Design a binder for this molecule. Structure first.
Ligand SMILES: *[C@@H]1O[C@H](CO)[C@@H](O)[C@H](O)[C@H]1NC(C)=O
Lengths: 49, 48, 48, 48
């Protein structure tokens, strides 16, 4: 019987943009998705434990 | 301050006991370099 | 008592041997690992 | 070498650290691509 899956995490700006910086400046106006992703992934990670 | 950063992240003046993910760190570049082929021949634009 | 003890020991030995010699016995955990790894690889591939 | 810098080789500009590499490039080969199709190994215009 499987019990828990691997706890994963993602970095928003590192993936969505690259090594550039004004790309993040453009990103800042698209919304607050990063909060949603961090909250959901943290919930999954704590649910595993 | 990191406590102030946590307060800003939670959007509250008081934070309960625990661990919170605030932001990300990354070391900034120190200097800059540039490399180009070793050419010193001007292109023929006057002749065109 | 002795017959049941012998049967139990033989059963344990057969379980060890069967688990050793069966490739598909542990399929579920390997499937979980494969699912996670493949999803992550697909994510990193879609960037291109 | 071994310092976080923002470089540009022949108009290909990017931020990172440049290290000595042991990849066996073919004489005609110039670039190096990873799984995500981002440049990983480069050949400088000078000193080859
Ligand atoms: C020009 O560049 C080539 C290739 O890197 C090198 O062999 C040569 O010595 C260079 N010449 C000068 C004057 O820097």
């Amino acid at each position: 019987l499987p019990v828990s899956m691997t706890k994963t995490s993602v970095d928003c700006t590192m993936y969505i943009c690259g090594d550039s910086t004004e790309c993040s400046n453009l990103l800042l106006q698209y919304g607050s998705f990063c909060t949603q992703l961090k909250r959901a992934l943290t919930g999954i990670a704590v649910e595993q434990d | 301050d990191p406590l102030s950063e946590t307060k800003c992240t939670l959007k509250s003046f008081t934070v309960e006991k625990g661990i919170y993910q605030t932001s990300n760190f990354r070391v900034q570049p120190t200097e800059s370099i540039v490399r180009f082929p070793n050419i010193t021949n001007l292109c023929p634009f006057d002749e065109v | 008592q002795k017959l049941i003890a012998n049967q139990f020991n033989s059963a344990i030995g057969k379980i060890q041997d069967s688990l050793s010699s069966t490739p598909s016995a542990l399929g579920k955990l390997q499937d979980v690992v494969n699912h996670n790894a493949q999803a992550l690889n697909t994510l990193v591939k879609q960037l291109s | 070498k071994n310092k976080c810098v923002n470089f540009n080789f022949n108009g290909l500009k990017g931020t990172g650290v440049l290290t000595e590499s042991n990849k066996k490039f073919l004489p005609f080969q110039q670039f190096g691509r990873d799984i995500a199709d981002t440049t990983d190994a480069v050949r400088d215009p000078q000193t080859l």
